[PDB]
C-alpha cells in the first residue's frame, strides 16, 4: 500500500537522523571503550553480572537493519551500555570514569535528537 511505503519512508528517516546520533555519541568515546562487545574469552564470568550486554558496535548492526522503531528504543541500548559498564567496573576504574563522560556528554546531543524526531515527526 501507499501508507506502508510512507511508513517505511518516516522509519529511513529516522534511521538517517538515529545514524548521525550514533556517530555523534560515539565521538564522545575517543578511547573506544564501547566500540565492541566485551569478549566472554576475555572476561568469561560477564553474563552472570551483566544480563542484557550492548555496545556501539551491536546498536549500529540493529539501526542499519533499521531496527530502532522510535528514539526510545535506541536511547534504551544507549542507556545500556553506560548502565551494564558502571555496574560490572568500580568507581576508580578507567572504564566506570569513561561511562561517566560518555553519558554526561550524550545528554547533550540525545536532548536536541528528541526535539528534532518531534519536531520532524
Known amino acids: 500500500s501507499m501508507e506502508q ?12 537522523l538515529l545514524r548521525s546520533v550514533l556517530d555523534q555519541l560515539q565521538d564522545k568515546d ?11 574469552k576475555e572476561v568469561p564470568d560477564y553474563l552472570d553480572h551483566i544480563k542484557h550486554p550492548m555496545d556501539f558496535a551491536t546498536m549500529r548492526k ?4 533499521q531496527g530502532y522503531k ?4 535506541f536511547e534504551e541500548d544507549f542507556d545500556l551500555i553506560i548502565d551494564n559498564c558502571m ?18 556528554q550524550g545528554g547533550v546531543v540525545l536532548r536536541q535528537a528528541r526535539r528534532e524526531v518531534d519536531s520532524i515527526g
Open 30 to 40: 575517543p578511547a573506544r571503550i564501547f566500540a565492541q562487545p566485551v569478549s566472554l
Open 62 to 65: 540493529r539501526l542499519e537493519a
Open 70 to 73: 522510535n528514539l526510545h528504543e
Open 87 to 104: 555496574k560490572y567496573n568500580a568507581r576508580d576504574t578507567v572504564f566506570y570514569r569513561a561511562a561517566v563522560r560518555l553519558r554526561d
Open 5 to 16: 511505503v510512507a511508513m517505511e519512508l518516516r522509519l529511513t528517516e529516522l534511521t538517517r
